[PDB]
Subunit: 466 residues, 4 copies
């Protein structure tokens, strides 16, 4: 495992403490053995997400201080429009309060736009993998969300360069099966979050776009982690070995028609989202019409001016290769610590999170007893670290049958915020999980004390099986 | 006209400049004679809105600096929950990125809640007056938005204590006409924005709530300007002459079951919103399920932690009577300056804006030529002040026929941000409009150069009728 | 009286409250009837100084946020050096923690430099009027402080353009009496603070510098309020009628060899100072040698990097003519309010403060009973406004006899911070003092309850004589 | 070598970059091979000092934001006064702009007070070791500064618990030789800076104070690094093994009569200083009289209110054992990396810096050619790290002879700022120096290109002898 030194220094700190074992036991009991119900004061290191918890630079805060809060025509709106033109070569922008706000703006408009001439009768969206909220807005608008990630992503511990790739064969298959008139849009997710933050290759993005243009299908780039995807393209594609990150980004967005972005991820913000449209002025006008009642007026879109200001600066900082090398390297360092201790992970590590295969850690716990959640709770009790379950607990029940949906994998996700924790915090996490190895065989599963009908993993209360 | 001195002093300033006469003329032409298309850099004093442009206190900024950005269980979420319990005596909160986000969370849930028992087949919402975004979400969910403000509000220049009151007779009539089973909810807007920021009396809120309870109807308090309403209740109701503002507020919310709030208004923020529910845990659970895809996880609701932190402090500051007396006194001062100069306005002035009857200023400009918009453009060209039209330009076309709906009044709204402008800025606005008297008779109407199908007053380009 | 509108709007506020009559009485009694002993929490509007109480801009705060805190070679040090070259055309800078820190750096160095040839055995400094701390450092190094302001400043109520002028006759007289060998330096104070903030004309500065060069005397520009002086020169000298403020500034500093500056005044800061030297590299080197033990290392000079950053931005903002017109106009407005009510003041008002002649308001109070202080205390009890005494209380006792020194004038100084208070705050001050007119004949003087030997006006406790 | 995890996470970052070797070669050559002349933009990691470069907490920034800038009676002055009473049990405080400002306030007052009683005819100061500015102010007032650190501090690599201790025998000898009437004050420096950040034991502080009280000598605690001293006392003295840091601090100040403190060190500030006096009201009054012309009025002392606010918060954070354990442990880790590679250092590492004996790394470079400066320059060219020389270059020439004084040790000081750099930055520093092992034998000395008469090490320009 190799540590990469920060290309920055610390300007401001925030205190975090390890509560005593007695407090953690009491807190987890109060949270119903569900860390999503823990208060942040009960948490030492928070690995729940990489969304909105990043550390900003002094330049970002300075931009916020001089932010323009005007209701219409904020100076920062035009800066943001110019920045999108510089980075992506797209001519239209609509700010949003965050990524799912951007999806709520654009996706219903794409459905209306596809239907306007009498198409989209059995409408579908096709993606390498839809993110959870992305797929939710697809389904809330009466559409089917189809995921066709490459098969290389399902062999978790076997290395591959582009585990986020579309399966090109399955893409052509779905176009023939559903017809180009029913495909509202193709969503290229970069990096592919649901495959574990694994990159999509430039040639895969190019081929997907060429297929979409011959069939007249609109392409949306889900761009939450477009800078981590660009770093991987430079690191693993020989064509871009000597390109700048910005040059990689510019080529990526030749292969889409628009983008939805959570600025809470790679742009290094705590809040914020963005819709950008390449050149389709009609979709831009329709998305503006939906933005006003849903998010706010079209020159701030549910963002404070100071947050559009921070987004302009963060979009620049998020492309800096030295930071990307350190950031993605820190995630790799945590993964390499676990792998060298025999802990099975998804390999290679993605850009923002390490995924630990808990099924191999607690084999005595069946899937319907949430093995990954048992390891997560054990991890919290031992260390104060809070992680999140990507497995049977998250997957939920089948709506028609009421049965536990089958999970292929029982993952514990260790999601790493940007510029927040040191490699010593990474060592603290690894040494905490490694120290559970003799106790894994003794862990018991979990059963429900309270289970809501939908979105159970957020608020359900569990209890240990004794 | 009486000036009220600030109960604060200035800690930080932001530079604004008056562009030269030619720069203002060039900018207005570039904006297509629509000030909504102006960049903020072409504006000296901005009166477009009182939303999100407020000046925070140093205590609010300090609260942001120590804000807890945690994804789940942020310390500021629990503070905000305690504050809602303190001010409103409500047990449940869901933060939202702003006011229309709060409505998108709650209003579709109230409909599904009403429809689940097999009724609400022709559902309606009843309000003293729906705000634009409120009515939009009502109609987007297939419901009719019914407005029943007291008739005293339509006599613009005639004083009344409570021009925002419900018409009780019309409320009982609509309950009988549609049936209590089709009324999803009653929305009490305080102050009543569309009546001009005019207050609702405590007895009116009480009678509305009592009528709604006799029919089992849910009551939502639209609370964007609830602190200005409480001040008016203390100023004009002898029952509360010796009550604190918080005591009036506490009584107000005995007459609702929940609230939606734009914190970009009276809570003195630049962004932020809030749903609070009194005690109906089922509606709270359903609104949380919708919050997740639409706004974010339920402990931040599309807000940065720092913005929840500022909201806790701003909710306190927004109730301070000395500030409220100054704020509303500054609005009254601008109105009295114009009224004493013979400019006809809505009287008494509301809590947040002055409305100027422009047809009496430019009678040679008929309503279909947008007389209020012509007055606004002239005000901009003389002074750099940007105001907004509440008249025929705003009212728009009938969607079925495509014809210009005619507005009964042609208002220019001078909307005043909180703690931003001095009474010297108020004199500058008044003196500019008063100085326009000899040029009012020479003003020309306006016609469309480009008219979009939707968002007409926002983006349409106009041209002078030569 | 004419109010001038702010060329800015408020971005952040700070709460101030008027304590009740009983609280003010208790606080003043607890402070021993000396407002210098009051805590700020007992003060509504603070008129004690215009030093370090200014409101900064958002650009100044943004500059602090990215300030470079490096011990040696801070980016902000070089920015400050370039700014001094741009404004003053001086080649060397040494930051200081504030103005008296800069005087402590330079004045002992100028004395040692003058002494190097065996002269200056009876050394003096000559100024139009030494500021208190300036005169203090002159005497701390064993020198005599000579003040020779024009006779026009002693006739308080008669208008003159340049009441801060040197008496050229007295300059040539003092040079002949003491000899150019004993004149360590001439200090040109702009504006002349002790004459009431009154400006020095360009021709007076030019004549003083030419007289000094023919005798080989060093000229130091005390530059605390150099921007207010430049505004007056443009306002009252037809030669500069069409010059920019920076052009006036540039000419002003052709007539000095170095400057000491408190940035807590015109550069709009809360802390900070500056020494700048035209081209004498020898004096610059000696001043650097003294800076290290007294203030800090020479690239920060007892300042935080963020404070050098704020000074660079504040030096720019302090020269803006629109701001200078508003600022000085607010001081004139306060003066005109009082003058139009029959309150005697020094006229015309200077750049930063109004001086009220209290001997004419309470003639029944002899000087040794502190008439101006009696008016100040009464003003505080009536309004919560805190002012400062420039009279017999400040002048102190004769060191030779121990008898009360005779004061020519008994002034109450109303010192106005920059961009902090509105003209409504000015009305509040004026109306409180005007409302005291019927009580002035009833006021009683003060005598000492506790008197320290030196600097009594800061900490002496007084009691009413009755 | 053991890494200790941060008891905090990063809230804001500051960009630093490693210039290429060609840029460093150009930058070092441009700076005349003296890193003190380098701009900070040429520096990646800055190890010049630990003064004023610390990273504040979000609570410290929030305290600044609500800081009270009042000229007299700032809320933060009284908070600071209460804090000094809480921590040290001292009843009087005088803020100062930084540590040498505090010494300029107090030390001339102690001399005048001693002379007022007919003593201090041949005045001296005695310390375990005077800091540079401390001794400078002693000599500026005509006194001799006597250093009597224990002999254990001169044995560089031999461990001892208390290498900052006073030599009691030399203390009693100096009292007899000079007489107690000539001892103006004893300065107890904690930690002992000039011994390398080495602690003073509680019993040593106690015995020194008891000796001083028997002779009527005033004791001043130079308290720049009093919290690092307190941690060492808890870490190494079994009597305080179970005491809190504050309890250790509270006992320490029973053994002094006053303190001078640079808050730019352990109180975690970028600027600021403090005088506190235990109970001698006369010394307090005299120090206030000197404070006014030298620093400012007595309720801010040359500090902005925001900086007194940060100092209150920083004094608390600086005492937190979890932070102190991490801070001092990070310094120990850098030392342990070097020791494990065979690099000779002073052992044990002090609280704030690592000292590398460069004579043993480059024995071919004699003392008059500055061997440590040669290692520093090579270290900068290899890595962008800037360190400072404590050897012949700093020691200077003998004033009587003008030849280079012989230095006992040629140290390179690696001074570590607080909460700024990670242990990965420590590895980067160590790995850079360790990678120089093959280049050490080839290194050439340095000779003067330009040498100033005083304080040459700040501004002298060197050239490689080759
Ligand atoms: K966040
Ligand atoms: K805003
Ligand atoms: K100040
Ligand atoms: K500093």
């Amino acid at each position: 495992a190799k540590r990469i030194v920060e290309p920055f220094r610390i300007k401001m700190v925030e205190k975090i403490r390890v509560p005593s074992r007695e407090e953690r036991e009491a807190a987890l009991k109060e949270a119903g053995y569900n860390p999503f119900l823990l208060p942040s004061s009960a948490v030492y290191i928070d690995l729940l997400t990489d969304s909105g918890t990043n550390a900003m630079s002094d330049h970002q805060w300075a931009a916020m201080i001089t932010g323009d809060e005007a209701y219409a025509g904020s100076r920062n709106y035009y800066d943001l429009k110019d920045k999108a033109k510089e980075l992506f070569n797209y001519d239209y922008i609509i700010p949003a309060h965050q990524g799912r706000g951007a999806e709520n703006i654009l996706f219903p408009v794409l459905l209306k736009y596809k239907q306007k001439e009498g198409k989209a009768k059995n409408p579908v969206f096709i993606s390498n993998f839809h993110f959870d909220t992305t797929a939710a807005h697809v389904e809330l608008n009466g559409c089917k969300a189809i995921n066709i990630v490459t098969e290389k992503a399902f062999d978790s511990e076997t290395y591959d360069d582009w585990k986020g790739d579309f399966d090109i064969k399955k893409l052509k298959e779905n176009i023939a099966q559903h017809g180009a008139d029913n495909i509202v849009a193709i969503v290229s997710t970069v990096t592919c979050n649901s495959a574990g933050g694994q990159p999509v290759s430039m040639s895969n993005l190019k081929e997907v776009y060429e297929i979409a243009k011959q069939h007249g299908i609109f392409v949306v780039m889900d761009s939450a982690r477009f800078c981590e995807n660009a770093y991987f393209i430079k690191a693993r594609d020989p064509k871009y070995k000597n390109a700048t990150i910005k040059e990689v980004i510019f080529d990526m967005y030749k292969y889409a028609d628009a983008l939805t972005m959570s600025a809470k991820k790679d742009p290094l913000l705590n809040i914020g989202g963005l819709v950008a449209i390449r050149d389709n002025e009609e979709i831009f006008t329709l998305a503006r019409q939906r933005c006003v009642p849903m998010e706010g007026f079209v020159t701030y879109g549910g963002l404070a001016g100071r947050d559009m200001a921070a987004m302009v600066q963060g979009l620049e900082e998020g492309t800096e290769e030295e930071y990307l090398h350190y950031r993605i390297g820190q995630v790799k360092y945590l993964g390499d610590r676990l792998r060298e201790a025999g802990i099975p992970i998804q390999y290679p590590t993605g850009g923002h999170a390490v995924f630990v295969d808990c099924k191999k850690l607690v084999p005595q716990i069946p899937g319907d007893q949430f093995p990954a959640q048992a390891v997560i709770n054990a991890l919290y009790l031992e260390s104060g670290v809070r992680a999140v379950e990507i497995g049977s607990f998250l997957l939920g029940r089948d709506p028609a049958t009421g049965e536990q949906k089958h999970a292929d994998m029982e993952f514990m996700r260790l999601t790493i915020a940007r510029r927040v924790y040191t490699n010593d915090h990474m060592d603290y996490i690894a040494d905490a999980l490694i120290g559970l190895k003799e106790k894994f065989a003794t862990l018991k599963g979990l059963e429900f004390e309270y289970e809501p009908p939908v979105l159970r993993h957020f608020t359900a209360r569990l209890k240990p099986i004794e």
